[PDB]
Design a protein around this ligand. Structure first.
Ligand SMILES: CCCCn1c(Cc2cc(OC)ccc2OC)nc2c(N)nc(F)nc21
Length: 208
């Protein structure tokens, strides 16, 4: 069954802002998502040092970028720590509240949208380019969940029946009609080179 949740007022407001503000430098969405993957891979890396069994659901620590022109999606896949249902429904929104407020104040003093990640809310930059985001995630202590939102003030969570993923997180960007340039091999490569050149895990760009 599909559960529908409201965003806390502040996130909904960050989300509208990201959708509504005129801002051409949309490409920074990719570095934000990659950096979130990097923090997650680090974390499962740290946790297995004192418990190697936390790696039984997969030993490879990596990042895959998969475009699919047929569906119109850019999926960012990591094998990092993954998210529990608690994360999805309460915890992530709890921690995001403060980062949101800070961010939203800075945008005045002179800051701009490319700085969202210095506040820990770079995930919602997904909405510069995607009309819908689907997030498939699997943590060691929980089952596999699908989170989803087209913004609008609500998101859903359901247990995922798709392909089992071991451990990690897939962010599936359903691109806006005018943003298919992020399906293109040479565009993604350019972006990864300029902003994500020095990540500590292999990034494999899949071709179509
Ligand atoms: C805010 C940092 C933690 C949340 N997070 C994020 C940021 C994030 C994801 C969300 O998914 C529905 C929602 C909100 C988020 O940040 C506020 N990306 C992650 C990732 N790839 N892997 C893991 F494991 N955790 C992630």
């Amino acid at each position: 069954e599909v559960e529908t949740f409201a965003f806390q007022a502040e996130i909904a407001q960050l989300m509208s802002l990201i959708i509504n503000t005129f801002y051409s430098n949309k490409e920074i969405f990719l570095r934000e998502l990659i950096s979130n993957s990097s923090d997650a891979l680090d974390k499962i890396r740290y946790e297995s040092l004192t418990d190697p069994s936390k790696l039984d659901s997969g030993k490879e620590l990596h990042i895959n970028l998969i475009p699919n022109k047929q569906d119109r999606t850019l999926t960012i896949v990591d094998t990092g720590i993954g998210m529990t249902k608690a994360d999805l429904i309460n915890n992530l929104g709890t921690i995001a509240k403060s980062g949101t407020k800070a961010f939203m104040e800075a945008l005045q003093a002179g800051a701009d949208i490319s700085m969202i990640g210095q506040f820990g809310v770079g995930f919602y930059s997904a909405y510069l380019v995607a009309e819908k985001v689907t997030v498939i995630t699997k943590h060691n202590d929980d089952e596999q969940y699908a989170w989803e939102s087209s913004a609008g003030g609500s998101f859903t969570v359901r247990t995922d029946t798709g392909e089992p993923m071991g451990r990690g997180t897939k962010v599936i960007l359903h691109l806006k009609e005018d943003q298919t340039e992020y399906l293109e091999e040479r565009r993604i490569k350019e972006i990864v080179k300029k902003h994500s050149q020095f990540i500590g895990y292999p990034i494999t760009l899949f071709v179509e």
